[PDB]
Design a protein around this ligand. Structure first.
Ligand code: CA
Ligand code: CL
Length: 221
């Protein structure tokens, strides 16, 4: 039945979460706001704009202005890009090769608008992905945990929800995939408790991308 595999990017394809969590923590700290690196991890999947708005609501009891969102998004992007560029998540490439060999369509579904990562997908995973078979922050009105990005990915691939599988690392993205009615595999690549991923609606849970890759052939859909 399976036709397509819908990969989240940060913490699934790229090992970018230490950087994302560090940059969110530091930039918020610069603005007088306390957001731990673990709390930044818990926001993974959101668009940058949604993250900024929700942190302001939670910490200052008020919405971020459009100007605050833009300033903070840029400051965070610049700090992120100041680090040596993020490397592949171990297991991603090997899994992608397995997926492509069995005739499935790889897709990206991401809350990222980070062009330094998006423009590196082809060089890191050659021959796997296509811009018209991707959903990024540039495509959505509401991102994860709303199912809108995953629903859009189904449409882009001409797929029904039962013809896809989602691979996610973050509770909000797991929630989005599950709520789009798609079978969702959680991969626990960060410091969170796996139970948070299962609680978010993940149909299956693996401790790493490599362990998911090692087990893929024995998964049946
Ligand atoms: Ca992610
Ligand atoms: Cl960024």
């Amino acid at each position: 039945k399976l036709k397509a595999v819908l990969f989240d990017m940060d913490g699934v394809l790229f090992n970018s979460m230490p950087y994302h969590s560090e940059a969110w923590h530091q930039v918020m700290k610069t603005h007088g706001l306390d957001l731990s690196r673990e709390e930044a991890y818990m926001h993974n999947g959101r668009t940058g704009a949604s993250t900024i708005n929700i942190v302001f609501q939670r910490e200052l009891g008020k919405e971020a202005t459009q100007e605050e969102i833009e300033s903070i998004y840029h400051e965070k992007s610049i700090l992120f890009n100041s680090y040596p560029e993020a490397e592949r998540m171990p297991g991603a490439w090997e899994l992608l090769q397995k997926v492509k060999s069995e005739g499935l369509t790889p897709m990206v579904v991401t809350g990222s608008g980070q062009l330094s990562l998006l423009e590196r997908l082809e060089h890191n995973f050659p021959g796997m992905f296509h811009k018209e078979l991707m959903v990024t922050a540039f495509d959505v009105k509401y991102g994860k945990p709303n199912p809108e990005p995953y629903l859009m990915a189904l449409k882009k691939g001409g797929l029904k929800a039962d013809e896809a599988v989602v691979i996610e690392n973050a509770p909000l993205g797991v929630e989005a995939g599950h709520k789009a009615g798609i079978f969702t595999i959680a991969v626990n690549t960060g410091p969170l408790d796996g139970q948070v991923l299962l609680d978010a609606g993940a149909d299956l849970l693996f401790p790493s991308m490599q362990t998911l890759c090692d087990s893929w052939d024995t998964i049946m859909l």
